[PDB]
Amino acid sequence: IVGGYTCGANTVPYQVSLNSGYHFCGGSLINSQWVVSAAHCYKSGIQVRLGEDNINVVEGNEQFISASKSIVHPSYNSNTLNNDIMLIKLKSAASLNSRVASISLPTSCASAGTQCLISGWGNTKSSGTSYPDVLKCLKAPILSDSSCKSAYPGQITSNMFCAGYLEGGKDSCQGDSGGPVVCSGKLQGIVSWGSGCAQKNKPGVYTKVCNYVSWIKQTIASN
Ligand SMILES: N=C(N)c1ccc(/C=N/NC(=O)c2cccnc2)cc1
Ligand SMILES: [Ca+2]
Numbered sequence: 626i627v628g629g630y631t632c633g634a635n636t637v638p639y640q641v642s643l644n645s646g647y648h649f650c651g652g653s654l655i656n657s658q659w660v661v662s663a664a665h666c667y668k669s670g671i672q673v674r675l676g677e678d679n680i681n682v683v684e685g686n687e688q689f690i691s692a693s694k695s696i697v698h699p700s701y702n703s704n705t706l707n708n709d710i711m712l713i714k715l716k717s718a719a720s721l722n723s724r725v726a727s728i729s730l731p732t733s734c735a736s737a738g739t740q741c742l743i744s745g746w747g748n749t750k751s752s753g754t755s756y757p758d759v760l761k762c763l764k765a766p767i768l769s770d771s772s773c774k775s776a777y778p779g780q781i782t783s784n785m786f787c788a789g790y791l792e793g794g795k796d797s798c799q800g801d802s803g804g805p806v807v808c809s810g811k812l813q814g815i816v817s818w819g820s821g822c823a824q825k826n827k828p829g830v831y832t833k834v835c836n837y838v839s840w841i842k843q844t845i846a847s848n
Contacts, residue, residue, distance in 0.1 A: 626743065627751045627823035628795035629763035634678035635686055637744045637760060639728035639812075640805060642674040643713075644689075651745040651804025653812050654727050657718040659845055662803035663815050663832065664701040664711040671695065673715055676725045679758045680746055686724045690715045696844055698837070707782045709817040709832045711803075712844055730842075731811040734835035737769040741788055741808035743829070745816060747800030751793070751823035756800060763797065765789045767808065768828055776826055784836055788814065789828035797829045798822035806831050 641652040641660055650666035652673065660673055676686035693716040698708040719725055735741070743763045749755050765788045773787035781787070788806060789796050797804070797816045806814025814831030821827060 626745055626747055626761035626763050626801060627749055627798050629761045632744055632760040632762040634684065635676060635724035637742070637762065638724050638726035640677070640744050640760060642677045642680050642746060643803065644672045644674050645670050648680045648746050648800070650802045651816060652713065653805040654719065654725070655730060655812065655841070656727050656845070657721055658715050660713040660715070661812065661815065661834070661841065662711050662713060663709045663817055664697045665703065665706065665709055665817070666803040667695060667697050667711055671713060673713060675719055678760055681758045688719055688725060690717055690719060692716065694848065696848065698840070705780070705782070706818050708784055710815060710834070710837050712841065714848060728805065728807060728812045729810060730838050731813055731835045734833065735767055735808045735811070735813045737767050739767045739808045740764055741767060741806045741813060743788065743797050743801070743804070743806050743816065745797060745801030745804040747802070748798040748822060751796070751821065763795055765795065773828070773830070776828060777820070777830065781830070784833050785817065785830050786814065786833050787828040787830055791826055791828060793825035794823050796823035
């Protein structure tokens with residue numbers, strides 16, 4: 626997260642860190658056994674780390690649970706990043722409490738202008754490289770689909786939306802991938818892609834979660 630703020634320990638209780646010996650992606654806990662992340666975060670040997678603030682220090686609220694299965698969206702295209710969504714099942718159910726909690730799935734899509742909270746442990750610099758240890762947060766509006774398409778000609782599908790600031794300076798970034806965009810208490814987006822980070826006229830692009838709620842529910846129901 627570039628141009629954001631320190632969230633505060635466990636203030637984003639659905640935020641997960643995906644760990645394969647090190648943090649490599651974010652994710653969102655959607656019930657006691659399932660995490661939503663980006664398909665581009667797919668790899669084997671994932672351990673899901675819940676209740677994290679400082680990802681380099683055991684602080685007392687963590688639950689570390691290995692993934693038992695990963696399900697990349699059937700239509701994920703790694704070249705276009707269309708359908709950039711994946712489900713991860715935990716080997717055991719998380720113990721849900723104030724600091725480890727699921728986030729509600731949307732029942733309808735969000736509109737341009739809605740404010741959202743984007744969070745993660747990704748790069749904090751738009752030019753250089755600095756990775757934070759504690760969770761960073763950014764409040765950002767959803768942008769109109771027309772401005773999104775204008776920013777990224779030929780690249781925005783109906784499964785994507787832009788959020789952030791066309792002036793630059795405030796954005797998600799590398800390492801935030803797979804993490805949440807939460808708007809009015811619903812998971813509306815997943816950190817997917819962008820051109821650099823926090824660059825002028827290049828806002829963050831996010832997976833449009835409301836399109837996938839049907840697939841998420843039925844997948845969970847049979848797995
Ligand atoms: N501007 C955003 N909101 C944004 C931009 C990019 C990304 C993702 N980056 N990933 C990388 O660079 C990368 C990751 C692994 C290996 N090699 C390169 C997320 C958000
Ligand atoms: Ca920790």
